[PDB]
Amino acid sequence: KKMRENNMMSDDVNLAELAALTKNFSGAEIEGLVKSASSFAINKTVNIGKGATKLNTKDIAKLKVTREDFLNALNDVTPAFGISEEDLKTCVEGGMMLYSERVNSILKN
Amino acid sequence: YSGKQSYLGSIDIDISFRARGKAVSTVFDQDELAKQFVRCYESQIFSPTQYLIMEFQGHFFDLKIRNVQAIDLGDIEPTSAVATGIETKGILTKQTQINFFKGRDGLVN
C-alpha cells in the first residue's frame, strides 16, 4: 500500500498475476515475499562487501522495485502446505509425447 | 607522488569528545561541521590515521580520518576505491563529501 502511494513502485508489476502464481501461500508468507523483493532492490545499490561506499544521493533518489525481483524472490520463500504437489510436477520431468492417437483420447475422456 | 589523484573526493572523519566531562547533548549540524573543517583547514593534505583538534562553538573535539578517497579533477563519478592504507593522501576542497562517524565512545550526538 504505502509503496505505491509513495511512488516507489515500477508500473510494470500487475498484482493479479502475483496472486495467480502463489497457489498455497498462507497469509503470513506474502509478507516475506515483499521483504525479499525489496531486499534485492536495495542490495543492487549497496553491494555489501567488495564494492563498498557507493552510497550516494543519485542512487537512492530513484529506487524502484521491478517485476523480475519478485520472480527472483519466488526462489527464496517456499510454501509450507504446498509440498506434495511438487512431487506431481516433477513426475512429468521426462516430458510428454503424443506418439499415438490413443493418448489424446484418454486425456480427453 | 600521487600522479593524478591529488584532491579529496570523500573524507571520512570519526568525531569524538576530548573531555569525557564536557559531553553536551546539543544537536550538531553536519553541514556546519564540514564548513568548520573547510574554513579552518583548506587545501591541506590529509592522510588516513592523521589526528586533528577542532574547536566548534567553543567545544573541543578529536577528529580522526578513518579512510580517504583521493580523486583527480575531472572525474565525474567517484570510481576510485576508498583506501584504508595510510599511503593515500589528497588535498582538501570545498566540495568533499564529509561523513562524520561516532567515536569509539559514542557520545557525540
Swiss-Prot record, chain A:
Subcellular location: Cytoplasm
Source organism superkingdom: Eukaryota
Subunit structure: Homohexamer. Binds to SEC17.
Known role: Required for vesicle-mediated transport. Catalyzes the fusion of transport vesicles within the Golgi cisternae. Is also required for transport from the endoplasmic reticulum to the Golgi stack. Seems to function as a fusion protein required for the delivery of cargo proteins to all compartments of the Golgi stack independent of vesicle origin.
More info: Present with 5920 molecules/cell in log phase SD medium.
Family note: Belongs to the AAA ATPase family.
Name of the molecule in the record: Vesicular-fusion protein SEC18
